[PDB]
Design a protein around this ligand. Sequence first.
Ligand SMILES: [Br-]
Ligand SMILES: [Mg+2]
Length: 955
Amino acid sequence: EVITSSERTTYNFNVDWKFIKSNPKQAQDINYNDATWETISCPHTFNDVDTFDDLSHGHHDGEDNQWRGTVWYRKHFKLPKDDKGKKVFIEFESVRQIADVYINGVHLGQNQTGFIPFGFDLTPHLKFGEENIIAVKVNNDRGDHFRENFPLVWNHEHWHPTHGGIYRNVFLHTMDPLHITLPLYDNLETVGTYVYAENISEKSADITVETEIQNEHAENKNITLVTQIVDNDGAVVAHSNKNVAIPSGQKMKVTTVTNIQNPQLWYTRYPYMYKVVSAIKESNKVIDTYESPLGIRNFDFNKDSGFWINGEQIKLHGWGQKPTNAWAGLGAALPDWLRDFTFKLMDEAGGNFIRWGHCAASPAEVDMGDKYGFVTLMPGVSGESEDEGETWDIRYKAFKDLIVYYRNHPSIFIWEGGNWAESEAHYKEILEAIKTFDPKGKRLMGNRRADVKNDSEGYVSIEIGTEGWEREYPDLPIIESEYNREEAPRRIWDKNSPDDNFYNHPNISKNTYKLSSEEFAVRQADHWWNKMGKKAYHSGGANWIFSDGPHGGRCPTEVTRASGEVDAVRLPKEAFYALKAMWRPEPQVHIVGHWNYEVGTKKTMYVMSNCASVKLYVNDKLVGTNSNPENGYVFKFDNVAWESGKIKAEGFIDDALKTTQTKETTGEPAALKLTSITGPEGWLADGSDVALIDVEVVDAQGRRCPLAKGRVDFTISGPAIWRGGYNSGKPNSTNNLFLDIEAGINRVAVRSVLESGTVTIMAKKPGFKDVSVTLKSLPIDFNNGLTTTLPQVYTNVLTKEPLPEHIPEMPESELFRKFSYTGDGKAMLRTNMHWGKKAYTDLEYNYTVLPRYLNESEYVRTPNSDNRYWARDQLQFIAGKKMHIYVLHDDTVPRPEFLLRDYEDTGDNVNVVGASMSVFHRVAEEGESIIMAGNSDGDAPENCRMYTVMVKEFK
Ligand SMILES: [Br-]
Ligand SMILES: [Mg+2]
């Protein structure tokens, strides 16, 4: 009963391209000789070999020591002379950053979005029955300074590592001249289908589908449009038909309304997915088919009680992940199944929310949101700025392309209008774009840092919060977009374990964060509980960064911003199991760390648990019972005496045993262990599929040694391309046929080639027997440059999960408008400045002598601990009245850019216990947006003073 076959064929266009990392003249020409170019397959990036190999700069400056410029791709392919009268479209999921596409030497156009799909009609230039050639000229250049990088201001490693090339999938679509259109607004100006659900209950739901159809034949067509609703088992549950005439050359939208009896609704704990099959028929003959996703759900982001879905209230907890999503050794060009692997890990740790930061996810990643039940906050392209001119035009156009592409996915609940407040006129345009292309989705709209412009009031539909600060729009629901900025490397367990190039790292004193995995894990509850978890009005939100990546960070001991709860090769940190124990709905306990300590060790043991009480045992001797968890989920046990053997925690709800975890002391190292991980279809010989290999050091019992480290050397043979892994704490650790073990394990990637065959990887380590794994890359159905086999992903992932069995108990200035501070320390607003008042929140230093104009001013007691911290939005407020702004800045600190841009030097100084602070003066009008960043732009003296702010009404 399900309509399957038609004139439409979707080809995978990833396999077998020619590539060159340069800009040769006439590279788009039909008869350009590309024989010496490199044979690759998409997804592909030429920055896989020169990223994750530079130690972080800190100061939120991302990795810039990588190749940037103009490169070229060329692909040969032949369509059957059979298809001689078919439309042919090419679709690019994304190209980074500027793409120019050519077909047989004819330029089709450019796309500068870097992260949004686009496509072109090849038909007028195709030679059927002959070889055709696509050429893609790609540029990934960007201006050095993230504030002077126009127009593509989102294109900067500050937020988005500039990994260039065709880093997502490419498809070829062939179809009848009479066809449903493709949702690639750039540059086809078509929108495909629009699916929305109304009058939803458990009993009934009405699905409206508007199908845009185009008749590119020279004669009118009388057609029947069929809308089929297909459930999770592939059964047709309901259908609708409409008989319409499409005049020759015309586009029209055909609407159907189809009722579903007893719909399976879409929940975060049961993301039931329907599919809509749209078919064009010409009397029993099927001309075209197109499939659209369908998840049926009612929802409410409520200002008082958080988020509801289908009448159940659900706390949202998940991650903010970079769209680059890069994998060490591979860059941003993840095969879809590695994107699925990343997503399955978020799902494993209880995620039900995702924000892409700060450009759109790939298409398959929105499919993964759909099938794992992730409420999604989706941006188009953005950096961190109110934009204008051409920057706004390109970004706004990308926003339309984005809605046209993604509007039918049920995982999307909020359109992120931007990663900064915007002008009133631009808010109008944002709502007008949603009204044009998504009038019926009931999605909300917000911008992060909307609170820094009065423009946002009355336009944003949901407060997009930062770092769990107090709500600034109590009329609205609130969702957290980026909380917990901390970093910590996977390889450091705790201060009771031997150091692994961290506490003694040459760069350790430049780190903002010097946390072990245990501290990083345990504090996950501090951050979550106090910023979202304990607030019944708070919908929840996104933990900043899921996987380590070389975007801007604060720890030059690492080659990434180490803020993920898994590392850049998706090895989980203890913090991953902390969040998993807090956020999963079933009862959980997780003992933080390991059980290989020295004889006589005494340490605090942390159990993370969503249970009500936890019991702790050392070799079956009960050492404690805790019914008073800290921050909802931390059951700690002080001064536990280590004993070789076994440590076991028990989790209880209502004094009934729910779950148990045991960790064991490992024995001495005894062998290397190699374990392979491939995609669900196996390792495919397509030139880009990846096989992962876990290399471990194990004891005689086969348990991973948590303290093992040291260099392993590798050899590879067979048709494959070694891509290595990384060591977070070391430069130039990528590519090499050797790698250090960290806490007993590391992970390398092997990429296939077009030739299928047997591939052998051997690992060696002094003192161990050699070990090996044998892989087989499997042949794919490939011919004339084309395959109908789509990129492999995990299928049939639908299961039902229960609601949590236990949730921890929850508790009971006219000038500094919308003040907020995002440094690690605490700021404090205070009034009536004069001699004797404290200058900082974390010191007892007082102001003594003051220039006359400073007295009676309102002031911000800043935390001196943030004296070398940097954040774009460190300190902000809207000027409540016309006022004087004074910034006291340590003379020993290089003046930061925001100070020199908008503040003049007074000549006067204010001495505060030996430190001379120059006053900088600024007059602000009422409503002016006052944004302050780090004390210094780069390095500074370790013992310098954090700056302070003073404010007085103009009068
Ligand atoms: Br990244
Ligand atoms: Mg994180």
